[PDB]
């Protein structure tokens, strides 16, 4: 529309959301993945994940301070996807591909799942 | 770096943050601007504004649920900048330019201030 577009604004916001997370500022949830914990902002989690969207949009689960992921979710894969959520950068490699794809399916991250598929299809 | 770049991810996150705001989901602050109120997410406000960054990063003001802006801040200009924060789209026109620039200066939004300046310089 008529409005002036700032092509760098969305990435600048995300960069500052990542800094808040690295500074533990206004984080409101702890995600427990086996023997590891990850603090995050529910608004970001919802924005990036069908699983977290379906949890927090429900008034019954909205005020939860702790989420325990299913015991078979690997912390490595969760960490890679949480970083992705806050950076737009996906660290796919040969040693993590299966763990990441499986974690993205669980988190309901369709674009990441399809990218994990293009990766297997390539080289 | 080595990581896969998702060029649409940052704008998709922002779009979903705007939907949360339009759905009054996980908003944690009310900004009072004269006879008007605006609900928002403190994390977004901090990410876009030097004024809100300096408020909420301070442990003494972090848990505030209401912010009353100075009585001379016009609600029109604040509304335009809040929409910008959540969309990357800036609605600058002839009838609002002065109000928007003055509000951006108060909110400490340097890129918007400099853009308001390029606008006066142009046409
Ligand atoms: N307000 C708000 C809000 C905050 N996060 N968020 C997301 C989607 C969303 N709104 C929000 N939608 C999508 C659509 C219309 C609108 C409803 O408000 O509803 C259907 C729900 C779909 C669930 O699946 C996702 C939800 C979100 C993000 C992804 C997926 N699924 C992926 O495979 C990767 C990305 N986040
Ligand atoms: N964590 C976190 C976090 C959340 N929001 N946010 C912002 C900047 C920021 N970190 C955060 N910085 C900037 C720098 C290093 C780092 C310190 O963490 O510190 C100096 C402070 C500057 C204040 O001015 C701004 C602050 C933010 C955004 C803008 C301005 N000033 C503008 O004129 C338009 C944009 N948001
Ligand atoms: Cl995705
Ligand atoms: Cl700015």
From Swiss-Prot, chains A, B:
Protein localization: Nucleus
Domain BTB, chain residue ranges per copy: 27-94
Tissue-specific expression: Expressed in germinal center T- and B-cells and in primary immature dendritic cells.
Effect of residue 54 to A: Abolished ubiquitination by the SCF(FBXL17) complex
Induction statement: Down-regulated during maturation of dendritic cells by selective stimuli such as bacterial lipopolysaccharides (LPS), CD40LG and zymosan. Protein levels decreases upon genotoxic stress in a dose- and time-dependent way.
Domain of life: Eukaryota
Post-translational modification: Phosphorylated by ATM in response to genotoxic stress. Phosphorylation induces its degradation by ubiquitin/proteasome pathway. Polyubiquitinated. Polyubiquitinated by SCF(FBXO11), leading to its degradation by the proteasome. Ubiquitinated by the SCF(FBXL17) complex, leading to its degradation by the proteasome: ubiquitination by the SCF(FBXL17) complex takes place when aberrant BTB domain dimers are formed.
Disease: Chromosomal aberrations involving BCL6 are a cause of B-cell non-Hodgkin lymphomas (B-cell NHL), including diffuse large B-cell lymphoma and follicular lymphoma. Approximately 40% of diffuse large B-cell lymphomas and 5 to 10% of follicular lymphomas are associated with chromosomal translocations that deregulate expression of BCL6 by juxtaposing heterologous promoters to the BCL6 coding domain. Translocation t(3;14)(q27;q32). Translocation t(3;22)(q27;q11) with immunoglobulin gene regions. Translocation t(3;7)(q27;p12) with IKZF1 gene 5'non-coding region.
Subunit composition and interactions: Homodimer. Interacts (via BTB domain) with the corepressors BCOR, NCOR1 and SMRT/NCOR2; the interactions are direct. Forms preferably ternary complexes with BCOR and SMRT/NCOR2 on target gene promoters but, on enhancer elements, interacts with SMRT/NCOR2 and HDAC3 to repress proximal gene expression. Interacts with histone deacetylases HDAC2, HDAC5 and HDAC9 (via the catalytic domain). Interacts with ZBTB7 and BCL6B. Interacts with SCF(FBXO11) complex; the interaction is independent of phosphorylation and promotes ubiquitination.
Cited function: Transcriptional repressor mainly required for germinal center (GC) formation and antibody affinity maturation which has different mechanisms of action specific to the lineage and biological functions. Forms complexes with different corepressors and histone deacetylases to repress the transcriptional expression of different subsets of target genes. Represses its target genes by binding directly to the DNA sequence 5'-TTCCTAGAA-3' (BCL6-binding site) or indirectly by repressing the transcriptional activity of transcription factors.
UniProt free text on domains: The BTB domain mediates homodimerization. Its dimer interface mediates peptide binding such as to corepressors BCOR and NCOR2. Interaction with corepressors through the BTB domain is needed to facilitate the rapid proliferation and survival of GC B-cells but is not involved in the T(FH) formation and BCL6-mediated suppression of T(H)2 and T(H)17 differentiationrequired for GC formation.
Protein name: B-cell lymphoma 6 protein
Residues of the full protein shown: 6 to 128 of 706
């Amino acid at each position: 529309d008529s409005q002036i577009q700032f092509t760098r604004h969305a990435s600048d916001v995300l960069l500052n959301l990542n800094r808040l997370r690295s500074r533990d500022i206004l984080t409101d949830v702890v995600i427990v993945v086996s023997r590891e914990q990850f603090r995050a902002h529910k608004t970001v989690l919802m924005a990036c994940s069908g699983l977290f969207y379906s949890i927090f949009t429900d008034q019954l689960k909205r005020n939860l301070s702790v989420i325990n992921l299913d015991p078979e979710i690997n912390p490595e894969g969760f960490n890679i996807l949480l970083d992705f959520m806050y950076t737009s950068r996906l660290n796919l490699r040969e040693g993590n591909i299966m763990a990441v794809m499986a974690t993205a399916m669980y988190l309901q991250m369709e674009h990441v799942v399809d990218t994990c598929r293009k990766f297997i299809k390539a080289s």
